[PDB]
Amino acid sequence: DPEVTLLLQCPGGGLPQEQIQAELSPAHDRRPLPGGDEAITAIWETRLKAQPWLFDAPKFRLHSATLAPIGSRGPQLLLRLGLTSYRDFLGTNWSSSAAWLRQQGATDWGDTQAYLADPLGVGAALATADDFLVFLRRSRQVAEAPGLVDVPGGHPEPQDLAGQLVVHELFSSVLQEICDEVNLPLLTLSQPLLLGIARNETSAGRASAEFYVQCSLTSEQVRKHYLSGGPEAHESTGIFFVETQNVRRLPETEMWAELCPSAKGAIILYNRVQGSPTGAALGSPALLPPL
Numbered sequence: 340d341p342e343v344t345l346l347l348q349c350p351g352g353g354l355p356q357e358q359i360q361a362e363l364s365p366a367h368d369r370r371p372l373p374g375g376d377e378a379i380t381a382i383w384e385t386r387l388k389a390q391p392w393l394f395d396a397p398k399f400r401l402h403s404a405t406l407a408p409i410g411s412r413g414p415q416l417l418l419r420l421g422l423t424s425y426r427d428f429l430g431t432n433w434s435s436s437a438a439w440l441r442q443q444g445a446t447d448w449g450d451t452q453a454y455l456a457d458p459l460g461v462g463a464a465l466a467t468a469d470d471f472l473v474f475l476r477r478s479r480q481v482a483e484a485p486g487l488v489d490v491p492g493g494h495p496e497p498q499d500l501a502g503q504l505v506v507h508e509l510f511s512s513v514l515q516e517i518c519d520e521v522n523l524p525l526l527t528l529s530q531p532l533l534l535g536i537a538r539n540e541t542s543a544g545r546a547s548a549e550f551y552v553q554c555s556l557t558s559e560q561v562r563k564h565y566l567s568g569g570p571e572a573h574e575s576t577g578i579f580f581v582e583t584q585n586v587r588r589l590p591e592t593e594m595w596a597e598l599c600p601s602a603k604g605a606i607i608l609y610n611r612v613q614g615s616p617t618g619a620a621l622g623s624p625a626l627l628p629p630l
């Protein structure tokens with residue numbers, strides 16, 4: 340799977356909010372482009388002269404993520420974050436010359452991402468009470484991965500001492516994205532666990548944090564809630580469910596070619612961190628069938 344790379348796999352079956360630190364610093368921002376940020380401003384002006392209803396928004400930038408030694412006490416992960424924007428994204432990661440910016444970043448900074456906006460996305464492996472994961476079908480009319488299968492998620496917007504408020508907004512945002520798109524009540528959702536971080540090599544390496552969330556509703560109840568919003572309550576065009584039993588071998592199915600890279604990241608991390616049992620009982624042949 341060349342279009343996705345794992346940056347982080349979390350230990351302990353995934354990390355709760357209380358075990359993560361963020362460091363928000365202008366040191367973690369994109370570097371100004373070799374020939375000036377005028378190239379970004381020109382792309383944005385061109386785009387507004389065709390679609391004058393578009394608006395900019397701030398985004399978190401992922402710089403790096405350091406895991407503590409496994410089995411230790413205290414905070415288990417440090418996220419190094421800066422600030423970027425939708426405009427900077429459209430001028431760098433989504434530019435036709437994005438590969439040239441990666442090579443120049445390696446040359447100038449020893450960092451393929453130094454000239455890239457790299458806005459941090461969030462996604463969820465969302466499990467139902469009857470042991471299915473939730474999938475969404477993307478519109479065929481959007482710019483990114485048209486007509487492909489996705490999981491719930493988005494790109495959260497800004498507003499350990501500013502750090503703890505940023506970690507809170509990351510965890511809050513994946514629940515809010517589930518409520519907005521799947522039309523579920525907030526009280527049917529567990530506190531998320533961070534599974535890891537995956538990069539989309541089709542979008543010049545921009546990263547998404549992938550989370551596990553459990554819902555107290557069955558697949559049939561989740562479908563009812565999604566459909567009862569009507570066509571205007573969701574950006575997706577359909578919902579469907581796969582038994583967690585069958586998610587284990589999803590990369591061997593015909594579904595795998597229809598999954599967008601960030602959803603592939605969510606499913607690989609779910610299989611490595613929530614699946615793949617380590618103990619004698621769940622590891623026994625009848626419960627973990629060989630091959």
Ligand SMILES: Fc1ccc(Cn2cnc3ccccc32)cc1
Nearest residue numbers: 398424425428433458482483494
């Ligand atoms: F920081 C962000 C990163 C991606 C999106 C998703 N999105 C929205 N409009 C897009 C146009 C081209 C490609 C992707 C796009 C939003 C914010």
